[PDB]
């Protein structure tokens, strides 16, 4: 079907541009003309729903949804074939039920959209089935290649025939499906939730994506007890994306993509080198400072690691640094980005826990500074011990010229931090302002931007957001089961004798997260673990801002821990060195991170005092 | 199918607003910032193509396409049933072939769109089939109502079955249609065009719409001689709408609709009454002046007749004027609008004849003033003869206040005329400027416009333009047949002994048009007659600007001529009087119009000298 080969990309880019313009107009009108608008937010959320659905469809087409690949890599090809067939079957079922629930909920929408002219909510609720059909088509398309390469046992015609038969049964004899209700045959009772979770773990491990396994577990739970209750909970699937705080993700991603161009990074690194280059430790300090500077704009670590390593490692190697130490420094300095705001992890945690993003950012600011100072101290100690030389002192004129060149680029982090801390802007408004400023600077003051490049960047940002959107909707759906069955209360009742001692609970949770982070990627681990943990945290009367900061730091420590750390692989690839050297170099730099984690775990006041002062 | 019940309206309104904004930006940038844009025109035309197709679809759904209804009104109901079935059959066939040719031409599009980034022309050519499917669905929908009320013999299931069978044949064995080629059975030869024209007339009279009958005639001609040649000509169907001069129609219509509000007309009429009300003839002069003022903004006569009669007739009746005279004045004064620019008829003539719209607009101004002066003279003569009284002289303060009130509204005609005459703007730019100014005035100075009202007005303007678009495309298609066979040359060769005497040819053409205008509406008559007349005019070396002006005046005279004059019916309805009295009152006022037509026919220098001076 060649004439619909770019529908999602083009339509999503158009919607993205429209939303960007709408929010820009809102901010400009409110701040300058003192003329607040009452429809901009509603329209932006309405469009964002469709943007998210389109991103999900693109990800489904390209087979990019996140999944756990630890046990998969240990399987033979023959064994992998069966499991890869099974996961396609499950995803087919998931998309079918997706379409069904979308149609039903669209038919059920009644209330109007006040503050937008009284329009009906059907406009919001219609995005689900319309894009679900396209997702089904994309899945069928991908099955052709899957079977062609020999990775699955099922062709596309099988799925087409099954879809036709299922639609016929649905539209002409739905009462037949009442034989797929597990409650007919066995009454499990209270153990239904435990069985559902047990099968959830297995299907997740065999290779099914997290976003689909979270849906399958809830469907099994409802089928096990009483099916007709699913209709009440199915509205959350759509209501989750209609959120204003969640809207800041794509714009932060776009800002990072725009600022990650080669020209800007060169200026920033040149300034940092001219500044910090002449001290004992030298290029290590330069690398840490550059990472800290880029943290204020980037919302992720791997982007920083893969954007600057080629440049930094050259300087450190040339100065006289060993390969293992330089790899370790490059890998370790990357975790600053997710901690210093803005940060995608904090946004996800706030959305899941219904906490305010601004307080999370303010609370998490300090740990970034502590980690940076500790890293500088350790780098100084190592460089002094190993007897490296000192680079020449830079003269003033080079500092002046480097600062003059980098001025506009380095101004952005101050913009964002001032906008958020002072309360002038909300996080979404701050993201919009940063994106607009970056676009202006790229187009005019550096000439590196063009309209086609901007459109491609918007498409890329939407594609990235699509992966997160599915997990968000499904985790919101799964939280319904978790809360209804009161799993947290039962777990707390089981874990007696540790109450009144929250320190032991924190230690246990930290140990569990540290152990799990060795084999599972951070992004999947967050969604896997948070829904079960947040209610248990609320059970013991643990502050949620501090809990969010602690969990985010503990998960970011994961990308450094063998076997499976993305930072290690990226650094080894970029610097052209064996992963063993990178690992041995990182080992000496893990002590500061562990010490910081211990300090914040035992002294919550450190985290919790700044946000109260500011808010 | 409830959830697609407003698709055309909403999408077309959105596209209309987008085009309006694009042209506004182009004009503002070029005139103020001296920064010409090279993509605005291409984008506007590309969007206008889709707007026109959507309008055609809406008109097809509502059954509003123009047709000749003279012979139809004389038929019994039982005899009307057969013909009404036949016309549905023919329209079904026409839409089917429309879809087929759209698909073929979209597949055949190769060249790119320079000045728009090199995009492919498939974007332009894709509008045809996509909307043709929707037109087919709307036709099938309307057939249900048609059969329900007993006006046709065929249900909708019949058409659905026929469409399915025809599509199956088209897609799986198209070589079967080669039995529908009339050239297999009889080789008519040179008489093919004559036979096609004869059947064209025959089917047109039984009530088939003009737009479909032209297409049917062309298809029959091609099938009669050699079918495969149709593919070369089918591109004009799409290329006709991709025209910049044609883009001025909807915006002039929108300007008229916006300015036809109750408040503005009240101010204009109050000013006119305060100005011209105290002279022998009085309210007649007032009515003529008000019509002249409204001509500069309105592009049609019936709109002026129906938007002002209720107010004018009251004043004339109260003054002491008889009913027949007041009806005659009201009916006669309406023909100023189509003559004084802007005018839709002149735009259509220029599009069909490839002449410049600006020259036609400048040339048609003088007759619009001669007619007004002659009408004033005749009204004075009648009022003096019948001994009506004189109204009191208005004092200065009322004149000052009426002016002060109407100032902004009455400014618009000067805006348009100055913009066009001075060469500052092209007609499309002038239309855009007038629409923007009217919107601004309605929203701010007079506080009468709202976004919903503007959207509804845009929808109405698109609906009106949809009717014209189909006739434009089909007449462009039919011109190919007319030019290929050289009908004009043969007609000229038949009509020997009149060459070297263009006066006799003009007299013959004028007599024919005057005779035809008695039974056929002006809008249908223009498309019916122009395609054959224009080549014959070119044959005799007759200037085309003068020919266009003369034909437009001759056709506008039609709406006054019984049996069938729309002006008479509208005036009788609005003034609540019998059509016989309206006719007998119009009779005395037809002498000035005939004298003006004779004068311009015998003295082309009256028309042809102003445009040469200005251009
Ligand atoms: C593990 C995944 C479990 C999937 C759900 C198992 C039972 C679902 C069917 C069921 O309980 O029956 C009802 C639910 O049936 C469905 O609609 C389910 C649709 C999908 C069924 C499963 C598809 C994949 C099968 C393999 C009745 O049908 P209905 O809802 O269409 O009834 C009429 C009306 O729509 C009211 O809802
Ligand atoms: C009466 C039923 C209405 C439909 C008539 C047929 C419409 C499609 C005809 C067509 O496409 O051409 C055919 C040829 O048919 C004829 O020669 C006659 C067609 C109609 C005859 C004249 C109709 C007059 C209408 C009044 C077959 O060749 P093709 O053009 O399909 O070639 C393959 C591919 O589709 C593109 O080429
Ligand atoms: C609507 C999207 C249409 C679509 O799939 O876009 C392309 C259609 O080509 C076109 O340019 C067709 C435009 C049709 C617009 C309606 C596919 O072609 P592609 O993505 O392989 O083309 C690569 C260069 N854009
Ligand atoms: C735009 C796509 C078509 C929308 C459409 O036809 O919906 C109409 C409104 O329904 C609706 O309420 C459509 C809601 C939005 C549908 C998805 C976009 C028809 O339905 P209607 O009979 O209510 O339309 C008239 C009275 N509003
Ligand atoms: Na960050
Ligand atoms: Na790890
Ligand atoms: Na006019
Ligand atoms: Na007439």
Numbering used by the authors:
A (entry chain B), B (entry chain A): 1 to 615
Which text from the study accompanies this structure?
Dimeric HiSiaQM exists either as a side-by-side parallel dimer where both monomers face the same way, or an antiparallel dimer where one monomer is rotated around the dimer interface 180° relative to the other. The maps are of high resolution (overall 2.99 Å for the antiparallel dimer and 3.36 Å for the parallel dimer, FSC = 0.143 criterion) with both extending to 2.2 Å at the core, allowing for accurate fitting of helices and (almost) all side chains. Density for the antiparallel dimer is shown as it is higher resolution and was used for the structural analysis in this work. The buried interface area is small (~200 Å2) for the antiparallel configuration, and even smaller (~100 Å2) for the parallel configuration. Density consistent with phospholipids is coloured grey and is particularly present in the dimer interface of the higher resolution antiparallel dimer map. Indeed, we observe density for lipids in this region (best seen in the slightly higher resolution antiparallel dimer). Next, we examined the HiSiaQM Na+-binding sites in our cryo-EM structure. The higher resolution antiparallel dimer structure shows density for Na+ ions at both Na1 and Na2 sites, confirming the sites we identified and tested in PpSiaQM, and also the aforementioned stoichiometry of Na+ ions transported determined in the HiSiaQM proteoliposome assay. At the Na1 site, coordination is achieved by the backbone carbonyls of S298, G337, V340, and P342 in a tetrahedral pattern, with a valence = 1, as determined by CheckMyMetal. The antiparallel dimer is hard to rationalise from a physiological standpoint. In the antiparallel structure, the inverted monomer displays the cytoplasmic face towards the periplasm and will not bind SiaP, which is required for transport.
